[PDB]
Each structure stands twice: as structure tokens, then as C-alpha cells.
Amino acid sequence: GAMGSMERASLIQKAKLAEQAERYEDMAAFMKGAVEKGEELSCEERNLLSVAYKNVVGGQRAAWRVLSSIEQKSNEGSEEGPEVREYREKVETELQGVCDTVLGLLDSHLIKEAGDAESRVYLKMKGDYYRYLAEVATGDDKKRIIDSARSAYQEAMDISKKEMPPTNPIRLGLANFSVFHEIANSPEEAISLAKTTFDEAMADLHTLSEDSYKDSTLIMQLLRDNLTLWT
């Protein structure tokens, strides 16, 4: 609501300046305010939204994994206070808010108005931020958060299979689903999806310009290293 009196174009301009500044909280705040203007988002504006929230949740995820480990060492001959647990909690509570903020923007109303394949294949974002909630969930809803993410990934997978070529960078990035398969305890599903996705992009590379070629090979290489680490 903070950005409600600033112009849509002004928020886009300041979101890119925030990127250059590496002020990713401002960048998320601008792009949230841009989303809340009610207009659909251009392919470029989609990337600014995604890039901003990825960096904020990305440092929150990094800090959480640091605290969680000191906390595990704290409970194994260990000299005993609640301070590690309290701070790991607060940071995690902060992380859960940011995911809940992104999911609320996809749900109001970015997914319902996304009609084209490229825009709708937001469901990936929806899968990513439930996966982040999954990474920290330990209770009576961890099974339900995982299904929330899996279902979102699977909707994006069906549209991407039917509507985009096998080298399409959005399809290749979507095929994160494989890493979910570290959350879902399905490492064979993880590896099959990656070798299948890789091999079919490889067979389609002859159709691509030198520019498209470089884009697709980038993400195929992220699949190659993952396969390399799992095999």
C-alpha cells in the first residue's frame, strides 16, 4: 500500500535503479507496488519482480541455514540459552512473510489474468515460494505445503509441455521441479526429469539462432551440473 501514490512507470524505473544499487528490498517493494496497480505485467516486468524477491528470500534462506546449523550443533556434549532458537525463529518468521507476500501477489491476481503460456508458466514462482516454505516447515502442514508446491509445478509442467518448445528457457528453468524432487525425497524422479529435459532440449538446439542457443545452453548446463552431482 506504501507505493499506491506513485506512478506505475515510476515504480518500474526505480525497481531497475534498485537492481543497479543492489537494494533488493527496495526492488521488491517497488515491484510489489507495481503489481498492486492491477495491470498485467510485461515479460521484462515479470523478470524484475522475480529477480527482486529471489534475492531477498535468497539471503533470508542463507541466514536461516547458518542459524539452523549452529542450532543443531547446540543440541548434540554441548554446553547449553534460547537465543539461537529465538533468532532462527524470527528470521524464519521473516522468511515466511516474504513467501506469503509473493504467493499473495500471484493469487491476487497475477495467475487468474495470465492467459499466455509464457506468463502463466507464475505457477513456477508459485512452486518456488511454497518450496521455500517447505524448506523450513516441520509440523502438521509440511505435507500440505509440499503438495501445494508439487501441484503448482505440475500445472506449469503440463502447459509447458503442450505450449512451448523443449529449449524454451522458461520450460528449462521450470524443469527447479527436479530439485523439489531434496524436498519430495524422490531423487530418481529428480534425475529422470533432468536427463529427459536435457536430452530433448539438446535435440531441438539446431532450430535456434546464435542468441537463443546461448540462452538455452546456459540452463541445460545447470541441469548437467545437477545430474553430475546426483550421479
Binding site: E22, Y24, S50, V51, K54, N55, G58, G59, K124, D128, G173, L174, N176, V179, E182, I219, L222, L223, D225, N226, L229, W230
Partner: peptide, 10 residues
């Protein structure tokens, strides 16, 4: 080294 996910952090 961690596994790769789309996208990355600055």
C-alpha cells in the same frame, strides 16, 4: 557447491 536452481542471487 550447492545444486543449481533458477534463478540465482546477485
Amino acid at each position: 557447491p550447492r545444486r543449481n536452481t533458477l534463478p540465482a542471487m546477485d
